[PDB]
Structures are given as structure tokens and as C-alpha cells.
Design a protein around this ligand. Structure first.
Ligand SMILES: *CC(=O)N1C=CNCC1
Lengths: 178, 244
């Protein structure tokens, strides 16, 4: 079992703490969702290979430009998150997060991940976004951004329903092995 | 950690830690506030435990079993004694506030109504200046500590042998040397998230809402100062690289 490091990046409230929690927790948090995530070492078997995947979050570090890069040393895979109910979080991907990740983590594969895909057909989400001349991020807008920033791939998930979560982490393990 | 505090913080939430007949006597808003307060104490208990693994398991184990210089060990675990003192003191105050709040006849049923005062004391005056200087120093020596660890593991057989031995227990799975260093660096940025969520459920008593709003401002001022004070050291860096 080789050791690989994963770091999740993206704007505040893009669902990155929730995503790490739902993957690391054996049972869905039905009573309390923790505010923060410390770290976790996942035992993952992908395509016949056993890997110890260390999971790290950057939540809380978004306003601290000199503290935040301390999370990057020896990263093997970056999960770059945006929220599907937030087109503004997708716009910050190529100008803010991508230049930072390519500077501190050169040659590290980036997986662009569209979080909260359940909100794409939520009525409160659609009504609130319409009050700002907006709509939920379409699948092709996510793929075009992933293509444009040179991402390894594009993936979507829902931490609320657990759909697509296991697939994101198994694909991140495969990317870390290349 | 000590068994007493580990059992008191074994449950996934405050709602699960207290007796269900005690939980039923409280409003949902109180339960929500208490769950985030419980998470702040539980993560402070885990943080202090991470620093004891660094000082007692790694640092002292290297000094007592290896033939490395004392300056090598200092480069691997910078400010760990000062950090341990600051956080063990803070944890002691949090645990005493909980113990004082227990119901007579109970070791688990409690409600913490006042916390903002304790958070203002920790993040103001001399204790805040000491956290600021210590975290500015720690975070500036972070990269050097990781590079020094990697150099020793790949070159020294006995150092590699020591690491494999002390990190073999399952309880140490997420607590290797590099993991402990990043765990400590990330701790300070968790405080505004925890305090903001506690403040969200603390509007009932106005003195408490104001004490938590003051405490949030103090933590953010501290983080901004630690961020400004960082200048990442490099092993064998030349004066020319520094002044350019
Ligand atoms: C994932 C989640 O629900 N939360 C994380 C930080 N603030 C509170 C809730």
C-alpha cells in the first residue's frame, strides 16, 4: 500500500468539508454534521492496487495567502471544487485557484469537481439564482472549464445523497498513481 | 489523552454524549449551540493529543534512541514545547468550564451558557501575543521541518527504522511526522469556522452574542497577523537569496 496525498481546494461554502466528511465517515451523519475536518487516511483498492490516500482540506485558509500554501507540499492529486448552485464559484476557478495550484503543485493532476449536483433541479435554488439573472451550472459549462484549465478530468457529485462520491475518490487515486 | 476526557468526548455529538432524558428537557436551539461547543472542545482535545505525540513519542524518542544532534530534532519539531503549553492551558480552561456546568449526580449532563469570555481571554493580551509569535515562527519553519524529515528518512537507516517502529500502531494511522506538522499549522484556521457556527446559535443572551462577536474579531486579527509574519525558511539558504 503506497502512500498518496490528496488536497481539496475551492471557494468557501463550495461543499468541500461536507465531501471529505461523507467519504471518510462509515455511516451518513444523520444527527450532526461536523463544522471542520482534521485529516483522514483512506484505505482504497482501485483497479487492483492498494493505496493509503491521506485527505486534507483547505477550508478556513481561503483569506490567508501565506498560510494556505503550507497545505500543498508533496500533494499527489488536487480536487478543485465549485458548487453547481453557484456560477460565481466556477468563474473563480481559472483566475484564482488554477494559477495558485499550478505554481505550488506543478505537474500534479487536477480533477475539477462540480459539487451539490442535487441543487440543479431544486426549486428554491432556481428561484434564488433567477433573482440575479443566473441559473445552476450546466454539465457542459463544467466540462468546458475543466478542458480550458487543463484538468485531468471533470466529475460531479452530491455529498447530500452520496451519489458520485465514491467515484471521485477512486478516480483521484488513479490520477495520483500516474 | 487521558481515559476520562476520551470517554467524555467519545460520542459524535453533544446530543449523543448526554443522557437522552436530559437532552429531551432542552430546546433545539440549545442542542444546536451545545453540539458546536462540544466539537470545539473535542477538536482541542485532539489537537493537544497531536502535540503530545510530537513531544513525547517523536521528539523524546529521537533524543533517547538515536545519535542525532539536538539541533536536528529542533528543526524537525520547532516550538512544540511552547505550543503544547498554550493549548494544554486552553484545553484545561474549556474542560473546567464543562465540569463546572455538570449536573450534580452526573459526569456527562451539562450545558455551557458562557464561552465568549473564555475565548476573549485566550485571544487577547499577552496570551494572544504569545500565540501570534509562536505560530508565525512555527509556520515559517514548517517547510524546513518537512524537508529535514525527508532528508533523514531517505539517508539514515536507523532514523527510518525508528519511524516504522513508533508509527506502526493503528492509532497512529493519520499521525506521522509530516501529518502532525500540517495538523498543527491548520488548527488556527479552524477557530473562526467553529466560533462563527457557535455565534449563529447564541442569540438568546445578548451578552453572549457580543462576547462571541468580539472573540471572532480577535481570532481573525490574530490569523491576519500570523499570515503577515510568515517568511518561509530554507535549509542552506544564502543571504543573497534572502535580501533579493
Ligand atoms: C459540511 C457542513 O455542513 N458544515 C461545514 C462548516 N460550517 C457548518 C456546516
Amino acid at each position: 500500500a503506497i502512500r498518496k496525498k490528496l488536497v481539496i481546494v475551492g471557494d468557501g461554502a463550495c461543499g468541500k468539508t461536507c465531501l471529505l466528511i461523507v467519504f471518510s465517515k462509515d455511516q451518513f451523519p444523520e444527527v450532526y454534521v461536523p463544522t471542520v475536518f482534521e485529516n483522514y487516511v483512506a484505505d482504497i483498492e482501485v483497479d487492483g492496487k492498494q493505496v493509503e490516500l491521506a485527505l486534507w482540506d483547505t477550508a478556513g485558509q481561503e483569506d490567508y495567502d501565506r498560510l494556505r500554501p503550507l497545505s500543498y507540499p508533496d500533494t499527489d492529486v488536487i480536487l478543485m471544487c465549485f458548487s453547481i448552485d453557484s456560477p460565481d464559484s466556477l468563474e473563480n476557478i481559472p483566475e484564482k485557484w488554477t494559477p495558485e495550484v499550478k505554481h505550488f503543485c506543478p505537474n500534479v493532476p487536477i480533477i475539477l469537481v462540480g459539487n451539490k449536483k442535487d441543487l440543479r433541479n431544486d426549486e428554491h435554488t432556481r428561484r434564488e439564482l433567477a433573482k440575479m439573472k443566473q441559473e445552476p451550472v450546466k454539465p457542459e459549462e463544467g466540462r468546458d472549464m475543466a478542458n480550458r484549465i487543463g484538468a485531468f478530468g471533470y466529475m460531479e457529485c452530491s455529498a447530500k445523497t452520496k451519489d458520485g462520491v465514491r467515484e471521485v475518490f477512486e478516480m483521484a487515486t488513479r490520477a495520483a498513481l500516474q | 489523552s487521558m481515559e476520562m476526557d476520551e470517554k467524555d468526548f467519545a460520542a459524535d455529538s453533544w446530543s449523543l454524549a448526554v443522557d437522552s432524558s436530559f437532552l429531551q428537557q432542552h430546546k433545539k436551539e440549545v442542542m444546536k449551540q451545545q453540539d458546536v461547543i462540544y466539537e470545539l472542545i473535542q477538536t482541542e482535545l485532539h489537537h493537544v493529543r497531536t502535540l503530545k505525540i510530537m513531544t513525547r513519542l517523536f521528539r523524546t524518542g529521537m533524543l533517547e534512541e538515536l545519535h542525532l544532534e539536538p539541533g536536528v530534532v529542533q528543526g524537525l519539531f520547532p516550538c512544540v514545547d511552547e505550543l503544547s503549553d498554550i493549548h494544554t492551558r486552553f484545553l484545561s480552561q474549556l474542560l473546567e468550564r464543562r465540569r463546572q456546568a455538570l449536573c450534580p449526580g452526573s459526569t456527562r449532563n451539562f450545558v455551557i451558557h458562557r464561552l465568549g469570555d473564555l475565548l476573549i481571554s485566550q485571544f487577547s493580551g499577552p496570551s494572544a501575543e504569545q500565540m501570534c509569535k509562536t505560530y508565525s515562527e512555527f509556520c515559517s519553519r514548517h517547510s524546513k521541518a518537512l524537508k529535514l524529515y525527508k532528508e533523514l528518512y531517505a539517508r539514515d537507516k536507523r532514523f527510518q527504522q525508528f519511524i516504522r517502529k513508533v508509527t506502526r500502531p493503528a492509532v497512529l494511522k493519520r499521525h506521522g511526522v509530516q501529518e502532525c506538522i500540517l495538523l498543527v499549522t491548520q488548527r488556527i484556521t479552524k477557530y473562526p469556522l467553529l466560533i462563527s457556527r457557535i455565534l449563529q446559535h447564541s442569540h438568546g443572551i445578548e451578552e453572549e452574542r457580543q462576547d462571541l462577536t468580539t472573540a471572532l474579531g480577535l481570532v481573525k486579527e490574530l490569523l491576519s497577523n500570523v499570515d503577515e509574519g510568515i517568511y518561509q525558511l530554507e535549509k542552506g539558504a544564502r543571504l543573497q537569496e534572502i535580501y533579493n
